Amino acid sequence: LYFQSMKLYGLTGACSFVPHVALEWVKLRANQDYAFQAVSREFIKSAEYLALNPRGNVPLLVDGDLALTQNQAIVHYLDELYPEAKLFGSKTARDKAKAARWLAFFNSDVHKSFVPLFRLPSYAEGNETLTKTIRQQSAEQILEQLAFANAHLENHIFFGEEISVADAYLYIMLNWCRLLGLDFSHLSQLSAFMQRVEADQGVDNVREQEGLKG
Amino acid sequence: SMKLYGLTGACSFVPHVALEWVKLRANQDYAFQAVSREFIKSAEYLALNPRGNVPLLVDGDLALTQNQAIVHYLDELYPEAKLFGSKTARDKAKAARWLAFFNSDVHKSFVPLFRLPSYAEGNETLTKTIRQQSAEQILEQLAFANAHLENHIFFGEEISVADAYLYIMLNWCRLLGLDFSHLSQLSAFMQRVEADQGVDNVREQEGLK
Ligand SMILES: [Cl-]
Ligand SMILES: [Cl-]
């Protein structure tokens, strides 16, 4: 063989969940298989991995000689190659742009708010009171952004016209909230949204592959 | 025609450059509304854009936010404009990688330099520590972009929206007094970007010279 399938390196349950769902949708809707390599937090600090990707980040998508990082770049690339796959929830430019706007909001803005809850800023280590303040302020910021997504769901079923990469991104962040013990139950559209997303075959397959069921 | 709401010299410079390229390359004019920090808190603005942020692109009854969504939307509408530095899927994606790095990763390190976290106001030592960490983060990320430019003249195969984004961030560094003279490629990169007609037009419109 002279052409191998595309390969995604990802951390199970991390933001790389999103291009994983994208590739599964491509497999299901355009019959193109792909490879998934689950990486550990240590393997990405490894010599072998930094030889592929100096930023030592996931996701990484390899397609032949192209070694592409950034979730948004990866998904827009898969959408150019496979428009029939409707990764942005639609084939039309205006509806695709609206879903891309939600994807960028989730990836650039909301994701960032989680950072201090996953890794406390070094200057608060050992400072009990500042640690509590930082964690509460970040929780408040997440919930403020999630209210905005909740408001959208008051009259839409998904963040695309049909299910899209943006729904995959919110889905995984609400999975983080559950794992972190961050209660969003007062945002009434979110739990029903989680259930709809989990019913999607590609999402289901990826949750299974990444070990995310409970 | 389309209208862009932007804060002069802010991240909204990038879709402003994109529209000017569409103007120059695809013969489609657009409107630019410069907004103040107060106007984006206004009742009139919040009604258009409940997020109260810029950029905002209005195209008919489409009101689109987020820099990346805006530029991907214009690229779809005007592929001949080569907003990503190329027409081919692989080369466009490489440039979109850089755009996303600059928008999601690098821009974020600047945030505390423009707006200190609430918990740090009044606390002299902590404020100093937060500003130091931001500068260190920025310099590490700029070093990575600088390394790329040792073998490539732009972040696209030709000039692209990724280049515009790095350009405006280096303009912020100059305004913040964050020096990057030790990164040998950046000065020359800024001159190449300033030499492009679309960029030059936008810098003029936004009062940035
Ligand atoms: Cl990257
Ligand atoms: Cl937004």
Side-chain angles (χ1 to χ4, degrees), chain B residues 32 43 49 83-84 113 122 129 157-158:
Chain B
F32 176 60
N49 180 11
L83 295 176
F84 288 85
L113 298 179
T129 299
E157 289 289 308
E158 293 171 69

Short mmCIF file of all heavy atoms in Angstrom, two decimals, chain B residues 32 43 49 83-84 113 122 129 157-158:
data_model
loop_
_atom_site.label_atom_id
_atom_site.label_comp_id
_atom_site.label_asym_id
_atom_site.label_seq_id
_atom_site.Cartn_x
_atom_site.Cartn_y
_atom_site.Cartn_z
N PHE B 32 -17.36 48.86 7.49
CA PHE B 32 -16.65 48.69 8.75
C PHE B 32 -17.21 49.65 9.79
O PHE B 32 -17.26 50.87 9.55
CB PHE B 32 -15.15 48.95 8.57
CG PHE B 32 -14.38 48.88 9.86
CD1 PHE B 32 -14.35 47.70 10.62
CD2 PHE B 32 -13.68 50.00 10.35
CE1 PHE B 32 -13.65 47.64 11.82
CE2 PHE B 32 -12.98 49.93 11.56
CZ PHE B 32 -12.97 48.75 12.29
N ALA B 43 -27.01 48.86 25.16
CA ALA B 43 -28.28 48.19 24.89
C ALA B 43 -28.47 47.90 23.41
O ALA B 43 -28.99 46.84 23.04
CB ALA B 43 -29.44 49.05 25.41
N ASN B 49 -25.80 41.40 19.36
CA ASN B 49 -24.81 40.43 19.77
C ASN B 49 -24.81 40.24 21.28
O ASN B 49 -23.99 40.86 21.98
CB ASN B 49 -23.42 40.88 19.32
CG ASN B 49 -22.34 39.90 19.72
OD1 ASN B 49 -22.62 38.77 20.15
ND2 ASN B 49 -21.09 40.32 19.59
N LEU B 83 -7.75 33.46 1.28
CA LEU B 83 -7.62 34.03 2.63
C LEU B 83 -6.68 33.22 3.51
O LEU B 83 -6.04 33.77 4.40
CB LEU B 83 -8.99 34.21 3.31
CG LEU B 83 -9.98 35.21 2.70
CD1 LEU B 83 -11.30 35.16 3.44
CD2 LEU B 83 -9.45 36.65 2.64
N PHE B 84 -6.61 31.92 3.26
CA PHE B 84 -5.68 31.02 3.96
C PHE B 84 -4.33 30.81 3.26
O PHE B 84 -3.56 29.94 3.64
CB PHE B 84 -6.37 29.69 4.28
CG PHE B 84 -7.40 29.80 5.39
CD1 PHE B 84 -8.71 30.18 5.11
CD2 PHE B 84 -7.06 29.53 6.71
CE1 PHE B 84 -9.66 30.31 6.13
CE2 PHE B 84 -8.00 29.64 7.73
CZ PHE B 84 -9.31 30.02 7.44
N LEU B 113 -2.89 40.49 30.75
CA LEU B 113 -2.18 41.74 30.55
C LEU B 113 -3.14 42.88 30.21
O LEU B 113 -2.83 44.07 30.43
CB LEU B 113 -1.11 41.59 29.46
CG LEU B 113 0.01 40.57 29.73
CD1 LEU B 113 0.96 40.52 28.53
CD2 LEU B 113 0.77 40.91 31.00
N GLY B 122 -5.46 44.89 43.54
CA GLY B 122 -4.95 45.32 44.85
C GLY B 122 -3.72 44.58 45.37
O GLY B 122 -2.92 45.15 46.11
N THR B 129 3.25 38.68 39.65
CA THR B 129 3.44 37.27 39.27
C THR B 129 2.60 36.91 38.05
O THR B 129 3.10 36.25 37.12
CB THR B 129 3.11 36.34 40.45
OG1 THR B 129 4.00 36.63 41.54
CG2 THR B 129 3.22 34.90 40.03
N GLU B 157 1.13 29.53 2.39
CA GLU B 157 2.06 29.45 1.25
C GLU B 157 2.25 30.83 0.64
O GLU B 157 3.32 31.11 0.13
CB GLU B 157 1.57 28.47 0.16
CG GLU B 157 1.69 27.02 0.61
CD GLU B 157 3.15 26.59 0.67
OE1 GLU B 157 3.89 26.77 -0.32
OE2 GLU B 157 3.56 26.08 1.73
N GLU B 158 1.17 31.63 0.68
CA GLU B 158 1.18 33.08 0.49
C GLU B 158 0.64 33.72 1.77
O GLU B 158 0.19 33.01 2.66
CB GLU B 158 0.32 33.47 -0.73
CG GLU B 158 0.90 32.99 -2.06
CD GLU B 158 -0.05 33.17 -3.23
OE1 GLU B 158 -0.32 34.32 -3.62
OE2 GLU B 158 -0.55 32.17 -3.77
#
